[PDB]
Design a protein around this ligand. Structure first.
Ligand SMILES: [Mg+2]
Ligand SMILES: [Zn+2]
Ligand SMILES: [Zn+2]
Ligand SMILES: [Zn+2]
Lengths: 112, 86, 111, 98, 145, 165, 56, 49, 171
């Protein structure tokens, strides 16, 4: 109901048959009635495990899994104590973020 | 089946590994998310991963880990009989 | 949307065996014989039959189907053609190997 | 045919936005059309009515601002070409480098 | 006179023909503008390739032979010699030779690129016709210019 | 690993039944066994013997027309959906079966097994009604030069001797 | 081996010698896009009917 | 964004085999092809309709 | 021809059926996915024998699918056609190209070129039928047909028969 333009929201609805319904252009017919086994592609929320990386990524501690915390402004934010393993400073460095797409990878990422 | 070691002479570690625990929780969490029957009493919980953790703690996961050996032989270990010490 | 459902069993690749094509295999595997060094007909409207971009080898456009498997661009893996060389030619990556084999056997009886 | 999903409302009869008009992402700032050959149907939707295909230049997705100057002239070969300049203001924020 | 081999995207649910289709280039999706159903995914954009104009040269793919980081003059000379002794390319070489002279003539008078493109196109269209067989090549080039 | 990609053409006349239908078969246990071929009447008995057993499992936990209806009602009750193919088989077997009860088939099996013929051939012999040795020699080319007309003539007579109804 | 250096040369030698690859390494599985037999992939997770029945 | 070889190496060290497959298959190019049981070549003409 | 064969199948169970009575669901799936199905390697699988004693091996959980893959070994009755075999059937449909004979779970098509010269197509009669001096072939008629060729696909089998040889055709 929130739609794809209001966080927290959703962008796509995938039925059990594999059909994908775009939330945009779909409100004219009203909200879709969900059924068990369907997939709702929703915006990453707080506490969602994500993989945070910085190249060249010379060792395994340069790529670690974090918990999402949606915030204002256009910059990533991370604790100071975890900068040494990443070998990163805040003089302009950029870091990459990856979002797991399955429960298995979601649990694997957060437990290892 | 000469590649299946009988339970009487299993020589692998009786402790579930971190990798085994990670996959067991993920595999069970995925099944729960796809409307699988929960075999543990729920005191209020919606996250499939958390439900899986509760099942592992009470040893109510009906899965067995087939540990492979570098020659093709394997040993079957039930999740219930594997000690979770890590 | 994804690819359409298939009735063939789903399996995982277990072994990879490398080798060399036999001339018979290339002719049998191929779906069309290339004989024209052109790609489009005189009207530049549709691909010429027998040319490099023969419709039988597959399609790389979202609006055209493959003439062999009748599938779109997202499902057709591509179909191999063949060219019948007038005379045998060496393989650039095996010239060194060919030379060693030539010096290993007699050049008149193959022993 | 193949017109962009953006808005062409800001363009004038000459296919150029008059300077001073505010623009945003996906806004078309230079309108251009080219003729197409018949006997070419893509995803259907290609009828006898359609005789042109869009060749416009859209504004950058992440950029926005106000069109400052639009200049029209001819090149060495006599072909008409235009230059469009867009003004925008950058205010320091939590990500800027100093 | 041949196989159709045409793909038309229509929404199975809406069934309206013709359908309203919006191509979301940013999201790489083709979606029905009425119900929101996605009709096709993983659309491609529209170096390793060369662009040639099939109006002045038609369909003619050829590759030259030249020296590299390491090369012997013997192979280059003979390989170029072999390429010249081709019967299929001889017919088109005359047209190509005509274009080369036209470009030199047009470039010696300081004319825009559009003129030479038009002049070359005019030559190709009027070439290989029975009417233009008793006229000097100089007249043909001048008339095309 | 050898991709010889050479296969002999299947043919009933040459008794080349294929690669998965070889005479020497391996059961699920792993012991070698001979291929078992069933005639039209034998298949009818075996199939409906399992259907009645199937009916008993779920419950626990005659002329052609009346028999056809009894099988039809039994078929739907004891089988799930998409049974259109099974219905056609049972209807086809009832209208082309030559042996009704188990006793007749048991005698037939004990009869034809003395010839030592291939399982495919014996099943064909118990499946198609032949009146003369020539009739079986042409409709079943594999029989040629495998059994003398003297034995075949009496076998056909005895097969028709115990003909049903 | 072709993933490190001399990619084409190694592949040519494989064709001539008809080398067989068992796909027991990480590189083979990464190229083929299948779960490598490492970490969480060094074993198969199976279903236990003996314990499933006694749970309920 | 590029998930380079060095990034792949770190994930192999972490033991997240399943996640590595997901990045390389579901988050990137994924294609289904038909192979022949005799010849291991992707030359099977499949009329799925 | 009907055979009893030892067959194996790979069944997939959704996690929704991972309950105390999951084995029964596997049995139901076997009867719902095998019985009445067609296979090019084993022919038409008609009936499953020994329904109480199917050998079900331990299931393997798929990496990303989340469903369990079970290998199932069972005994079933299969009808497998072969070229050169002689079968009996009932005509179901008639057309100018030929008539179709129903033989158990299979439909055999008899082409005109595989038909005796005397037989001719007559569309004037309702229903259309092939008429000849000695006999007439129509729908519901019993025809003895010899299978001349068989083409087997992974999930479909089609065969063509002939009645030109002696002792074939109308019974
Ligand atoms: Mg820095
Ligand atoms: Zn194709
Ligand atoms: Zn629609
Ligand atoms: Zn093959």
């Amino acid at each position: 109901r929130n739609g794809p333009n209001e966080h927290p929201g959703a962008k796509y609805v995938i039925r059990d048959s594999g059909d994908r319904i775009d939330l945009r252009y779909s409100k004219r017919a009203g909200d879709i009635q969900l059924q068990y086994g369907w997939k709702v592609e929703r915006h990453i929320m707080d506490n969602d495990p994500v993989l945070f990386n910085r190249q060249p990524s010379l060792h395994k501690m340069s790529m670690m899994a974090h918990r999402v915390k949606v915030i204002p402004y256009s910059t990533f934010r991370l604790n100071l104590s975890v900068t040494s393993p990443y070998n990163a400073d805040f003089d302009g460095d950029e870091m990459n973020l990856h979002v797991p797409q399955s429960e298995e990878t979601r649990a694997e990422l957060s437990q290892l | 089946k000469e590649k299946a070691i009988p339970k009487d002479q299993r020589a692998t570690t009786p402790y579930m590994t971190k990798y085994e625990r990670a996959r067991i929780l993920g595999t069970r969490a995925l099944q729960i998310s796809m409307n699988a029957p929960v075999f543990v009493d729920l005191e209020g919980e919606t996250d499939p991963l958390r439900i899986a953790m509760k099942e592992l703690a009470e040893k109510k996961i009906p899965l067995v880990i087939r540990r492979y050996l570098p020659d093709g032989s394997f040993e079957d270990w039930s999740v219930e009989e594997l000690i979770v010490d890590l | 949307v994804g690819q359409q459902y298939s009735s063939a069993p789903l399996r995982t690749v277990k072994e990879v065996q490398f080798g060399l094509f036999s001339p018979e295999e290339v002719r049998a595997i191929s779906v069309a014989k290339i004989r024209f060094p052109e790609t489009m007909d005189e009207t530049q409207t549709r691909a010429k039959i027998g040319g490099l971009n023969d419709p039988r080898l597959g399609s790389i456009d979202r609006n055209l189907k493959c003439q062999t498997c009748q599938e779109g661009m997202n499902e057709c893996p591509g179909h191999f053609g063949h060219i019948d060389l007038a005379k045998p030619v060496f393989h650039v990556g095996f010239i060194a190997k060919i030379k060693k084999v030539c010096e290993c056997v007699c050049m008149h009886c193959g022993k | 045919l193949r017109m962009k999903h953006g808005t062409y409302d800001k363009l004038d009869d000459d296919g150029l936005i008059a300077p001073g008009v505010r623009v945003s992402g996906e806004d078309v700032i230079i309108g251009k059309t080219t003729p197409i050959s018949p006997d070419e149907e893509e995803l259907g939707q290609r009828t006898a009515y359609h005789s042109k295909r869009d060749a416009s230049t859209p504004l950058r997705s992440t950029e926005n601002g106000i069109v400052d100057q639009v200049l029209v002239t001819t090149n060495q070969d006599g072909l008409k070409f235009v230059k469009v300049r867009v003004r925008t203001t950058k205010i320091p924020q939590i990500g800027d480098k100093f | 006179r041949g196989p159709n081999l045409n793909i038309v995207l229509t929404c199975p649910e809406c069934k309206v023909y013709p359908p309203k289709i919006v191509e979301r280039f940013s999201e790489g999706d083709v979606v029905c503008a009425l119900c929101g159903l996605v009709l096709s995914d993983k659309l491609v954009d529209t170096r390793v390739g060369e662009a040639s104009n099939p109006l002045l040269d038609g369909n003619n793919l050829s590759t030259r032979i030249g020296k590299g980081e390491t090369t012997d003059m013997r192979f280059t000379k003979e390989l170029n010699k072999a390429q010249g002794k081709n019967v299929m390319d001889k017919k088109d070489n005359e047209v190509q030779a005509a274009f080369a002279k036209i470009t030199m003539l047009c470039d010696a008078a300081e004319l825009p690129k559009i003129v030479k493109d038009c002049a070359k196109e005019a030559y190709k269209l009027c070439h290989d016709e029975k009417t233009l067989k008793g006229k000097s090549m100089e007249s043909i080039m001048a008339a095309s210019i | 690993r050898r991709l010889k990609k050479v296969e002999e053409e299947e043919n009933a006349a040459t008794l080349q039944l294929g690669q998965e239908f070889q005479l020497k078969q391996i059961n699920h246990q792993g012991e070698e066994e001979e291929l078992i071929a069933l005639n039209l009447s034998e298949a009818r008995l075996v199939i409906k013997e399992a259907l009645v057993e199937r009916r008993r499992a779920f419950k626990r936990s005659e002329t052609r027309e009346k028999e056809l209806e009894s099988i039809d009602v039994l078929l739907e009750q004891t089988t799930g959906g998409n049974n259109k193919d099974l219905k056609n088989t049972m209807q086809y077997l009832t209208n082309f079966s030559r042996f009704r009860d188990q006793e007749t088939v048991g005698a037939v099996i004990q009869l034809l097994k003395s010839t030592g013929l291939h399982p495919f051939e014996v099943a064909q012999l118990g499946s198609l009604a032949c009146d003369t040795a020539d009739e079986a020699k042409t409709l079943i080319p594999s029989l040629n030069n495998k059994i003398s007309d003297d034995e075949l003539e009496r076998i056909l007579k005895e097969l028709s001797n115990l003909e049903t109804l | 081996r072709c993933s490190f250096e001399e990619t084409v040369e190694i592949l040519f030698e494989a064709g001539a010698s008809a080398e067989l690859d068992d796909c027991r390494g990480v590189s083979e599985n990464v190229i083929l896009g299948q779960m490598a037999p490492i970490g969480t992939g060094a074993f198969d997770v199976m279903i236990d009917e003996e314990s499933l029945v006694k749970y309920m | 964004l590029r998930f380079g070889e060095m990034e792949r190496d770190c994930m192999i060290a972490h033991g997240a085999a399943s996640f590595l497959k997901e990045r390389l298959m579901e988050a990137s190019d994924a294609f289904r092809v038909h192979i022949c049981g005799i010849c291991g070549l992707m030359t099977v003409i499949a009329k799925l309709n | 021809m009907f055979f009893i064969k030892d067959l194996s199948l790979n069944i997939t169970l959704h996690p929704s059926f991972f309950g105390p009575r999951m084995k029964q669901y596997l049995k139901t799936k076997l009867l719902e996915e095998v019985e009445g199905s067609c296979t090019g390697k084993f022919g038409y699988i008609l009936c499953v024998l020994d329904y109480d004693n199917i050998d079900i091996q331990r299931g393997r959980i798929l990496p990303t699918d989340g469903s369990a893959e079970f290998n199932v070994k069972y005994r079933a009755v299969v009808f497998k056609p072969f070229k050169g075999e002689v079968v009996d059937g009932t005509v179901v449909s008639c057309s100018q190209h030929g008539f179709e004979v129903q033989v158990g779970p299979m439909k055999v098509f008899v082409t005109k070129h595989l038909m005796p010269q005397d037989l001719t197509f007559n569309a004037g009669s309702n229903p259309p039928s092939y008429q000849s001096s000695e006999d007439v072939i129509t729908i519901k008629s019993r025809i003895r047909v010899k299978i001349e060729g068989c083409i087997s696909q992974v999930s479909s089998i089609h065969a063509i028969g002939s009645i030109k040889e002696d002792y074939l055709g109308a019974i």
